[PDB]
Structures are given as C-alpha cells and as structure tokens.
Design a protein. Structure first.
Length: 433
C-alpha cells in the first residue's frame, strides 16, 4: 500500500533531501495515488494521519485465527489480553459434513452443539492461549509500539533499535548502495581478478567514508519517527520529565531553607523548564561550559578548601550500586539497565570537580551520553536525579548545602538555558556590592 509496518515488524524510513518519509504517514493521497517511500512526519499532532496512531485510536479488538478457528481478542490499555470471543469454527474434514447434516436436520442440534459433539472443543484452552499471545504480538507491531527501524540513507540501509524512551540500543548497516557508473567495472574486476570480498570492495570504493555521518542520520530519523507518536511523548513525560522536575523541586525546598526563597524561586523555574522540555535538545558542551564558567567566575562564589574536599568525601563514601537502585525506584527509565555506569561517572567526576575546581569532565560526560544515542530528556533526567539524590542525602555540612545548591542549579541550568547562570549571579549569589 505500502504497509505501515513490514512483515518483520520493522518500520521503514527513507531520507530524501534531509527530509524523513515513512509508510506510517502516507497518504493515498490523493491520488496521487501513493508514494512508495511513505509520507512526511505530520507537523500538527491533530492531523488525521497523526491522530490515527494516538493510543486511544489503536485497536483493542484483534482478529486472529488458530488451526482454522477464528477469535476476536480484546486487549487492555497496555495491550494485554483480558478477553476473547470465538468468532468462527474450523471447516469440516471428517466425513464430518455428512454427520453434521444428520445432527442438524434429523436430531435438530443447534450448530454449536454439532461442534461440541464432534470434538471441536478438545483443544479449546490451548487455542485461546495461542490466540491471546498472537493478539499481544500484533499490539507490539503497531507503529507507536515499534522499536526496530529500517532506514534508507542515500540507499544504504540501517537497522536502528530503540528502547521505550527513545535511547538508541544499536544501529547496524544491513545493505549498501548500488554501484554507479565506473564503480561497476571496478567492482567486477576487484571481485574476479583480485578476489576481494564485497566488504573490501565497499571500502575501496569509498562506501565507508561517510558511514559515521549516515549512521547519525539514521539514529536521528528513527528517533524522530518514534518521537512523533503521542503514546511515546506521554510515556517520556510521565516517566522522565515529570520525575526530574519533582526532584529539582525537592532540592528547591531543601536548599531554599538554608538559602532563601530566591533560590526556591529559581529552583522552580528550572523544574518548570525541565517539565516542559518537550522536543528540545540539551545545550552543547561548549555552550554549557560558558554558562557554568559565568557562575564559577563570580568572586562572591568561593567555597573553602575544607568545604570542597569534604563534599568530595561524601561522594567517595557513596556506593554507586546503592544509588542506582534508588534511581530505579523513580521509573522504568531509570533502569536501562546500565545505569550504575552513569552514576559511577557522575560520582568520580564530581570528586574531580570538588578536588580540582575543574567541572569540565563532569559536563563532558553528559555530552557523551547524548552522542551515544541517549535521548536528551533521559540524560537530563539521570543527571538531575543523580545530583538530586546526593543533595538530599546531606547530611550534614550545613552551609556546604548552599554550595551544592548553587552548583546543581549551575550545571543543570547550564544544559537548559543561559538565563539560569544570570539568575544565579543576579539574585542568589550576593557579592560585593
Ligand atoms: Na533502498
């Protein structure tokens, strides 16, 4: 038609002129009649083709067929089988037809009694169990539920796999582009005269020169299609952005008590912006550093060497595994499950920060999450929540609490918006004069 999702349960994407197309969003259209590459991602979430895939418009009743028996299976809101209806029987084979004829016309048995008497119900439980499982798989193959993307970039293909929060689990090249012009002869010669493998031929013709860039494009395109489903944006909102916002809020109460309602106010601007983070991407390392340096270069913001390396001590005593399991309590998103590795690095780079005053390594580490394919929202979510967990365990400086309060607002706000650095300098730092 093309089909929305392929046989293999993958969603197709093609990038032409930097623009993304997918059968999920065609458009037959008008005619037309229909583009094989698919339709563009809709700009408006209440366009027909957008709304079509909203959670509330996905089928709850799935028709499946098992050994000739036809079932309609009802699924709940999470696509789990909570109901079944037997909608049709298997065809005779006997001689059952001649027998059924006698049962019907002579003995006046209703049709369903004919089936009982013929053993059609012997394996009824087993069939229903299969039917439900098959319906549950159909639900997982529905576009907003798809996590496997086949992406065509300049005619190379990449399988991109994502988790339920849009993080990239893998990207793998599955096809290369056809040979063009004099590449055909070159290739035929490399194969038959030189005995090169196809992989070595692709290398020699330059096919790998832009492999990193094309893979980034495919990661992005797959994410953008994944992000285009409201079902998916909403899960990220509940499980990631809302949670991170709540954590930033708690800190605002903790630190606000030792630092005034100017910080309470600021903490609430940050939390609000985290909550409304939407389709934004975290600011660059270079930009984030410049905003952080604006705070760190304030003369009114110096903490004692004793204060700093005691704050480092607290980090040193923190068990990374323990902290990660506590993050695990927030939502499914906080158990990749990496996730200890991200905590352990936040631990060791904060130590570096407190000991040396160099916060670069800490900010670089968050950049590297996103370069790895971790979604901006999740990076921000894990960074916030890890820093938060430290801030709430303190215990027991207790004006060094104000120091971490400034620092957290500084590193977190640096990822969101330069106005937070300004806010820190303008209204909470209080220097001379
Ligand atoms: Na292709």
């Amino acid at each position: 038609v093309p089909p929305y999702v392929d046989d293999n349960g993958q969603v197709r994407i093609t990038i032409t002129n930097g623009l993304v197309k997918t059968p999920v969003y065609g458009v037959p259209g008008a005619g037309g009649n229909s583009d094989v590459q698919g339709g563009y991602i809709p700009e408006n979430p209440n366009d027909e083709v957008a709304r079509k895939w909203d959670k509330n418009n996905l089928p709850r009743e799935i028709d499946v067929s098992i050994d000739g028996f036809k079932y309609r299976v009802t699924l709940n809101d999470n696509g789990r089988a909570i109901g079944i209806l037997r909608t049709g029987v298997r065809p005779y084979v006997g001689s059952e037809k001649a027998k059924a004829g006698i049962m019907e016309k002579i003995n006046h048995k209703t049709p369903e009694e004919i089936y009982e008497a013929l053993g059609f119900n012997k394996d009824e439980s087993q069939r229903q169990e299969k039917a439900k499982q098959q319906a549950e798989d159909a639900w997982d193959r529905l576009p907003p539920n798809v996590r496997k993307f086949d992406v065509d970039v300049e005619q190379f293909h990449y399988l991109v796999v994502l988790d339920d929060y849009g993080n990239v689990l893998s990207v793998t090249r599955t096809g290369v582009r056809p040979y063009v012009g004099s590449e055909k002869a070159k290739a035929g010669i490399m194969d038959k005269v030189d005995h090169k493998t196809p992989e070595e031929i692709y290398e020699a013709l330059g096919f790998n020169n832009e492999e990193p860039q094309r893979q980034n494009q495919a990661k992005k395109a797959a994410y953008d299609v994944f992000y285009s489903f409201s079902m998916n944006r909403d899960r990220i909102q509940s499980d990631v952005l809302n949670k991170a916002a709540e954590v930033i809020s708690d800190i605002g109460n903790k630190v606000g008590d030792y630092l005034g309602d100017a910080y309470k106010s600021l903490a609430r601007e940050i939390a609000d912006d985290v909550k409304n983070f939407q389709g934004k991407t975290i600011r660059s390392y270079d930009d984030a550093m410049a905003s952080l340096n604006k705070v760190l270069s304030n003369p009114g913001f110096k903490f004692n060497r004793a204060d700093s390396d005691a704050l480092a001590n607290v980090w040193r005593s923190i068990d990374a595994q323990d902290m990660a399991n506590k993050l695990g309590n927030i939502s499914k998103a906080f158990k990749f499950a990496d996730v200890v590795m991200k905590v352990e690095k936040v631990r060791e780079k904060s130590i570096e920060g407190y000991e040396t005053g160099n916060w670069g390594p800490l900010m670089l580490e968050v950049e590297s999450w996103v370069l790895s394919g971790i979604a901006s929202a999740v990076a921000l979510g894990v960074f916030s929540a890890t820093l938060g967990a430290y801030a709430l365990s303190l215990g027991a400086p207790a004006i060094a609490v104000g120091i971490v309060g400034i620092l957290l607002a500084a590193v977190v706000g640096a990822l969101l918006d330069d106005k937070f650095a300004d806010a820190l300098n303008k209204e909470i730092i209080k220097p001379a004069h």
